[PDB]
């Protein structure tokens, strides 16, 4: 019953920390949550043979640019770490 | 629900903006086509060839 949560920054950071702000926590919370969704599935696909290796490359896509999405995502995260700070 | 459903709508664009920034991120460096010889290569027999 005594939980007490509370509601220039100080406040601010807490309205990030609050999960359902309307229109700010949302848009805070889905689009990182996009952002670790497909720096999991980039993780993932790079170990296909068609995807990301030299699985079908031997004959003659593999593109080597997930490792750009890595880094924009690391980014993001690194970035957001500060934010968190 | 509604505003929720905006709110959604509003983030699907910012995601969608920064998506097409990570494709031409991906495109500023790009090596579809290589430039090669990709023929034969040179023998001694072509040395001795008269061409």
Known sequence: ?85 | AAAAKGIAIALLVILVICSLIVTSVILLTPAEDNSLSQKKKVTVEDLFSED
């Open chain 1, 1 to 85: 019953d005594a939980d007490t949560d509370t509601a220039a920054r100080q406040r601010v950071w807490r309205a990030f920390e609050n999960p359902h702000t309307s229109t700010m926590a949302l848009v805070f919370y889905y689009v990182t949550g996009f952002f670790i969704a497909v720096s999991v599935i980039a993780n993932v696909v790079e170990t296909v043979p068609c995807g990301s290796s030299p699985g079908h490359i031997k004959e003659l896509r593999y593109a080597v640019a997930f490792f750009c999405l890595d880094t924009a995502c690391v980014m993001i995260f690194t970035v957001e770490y500060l934010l968190r700070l």
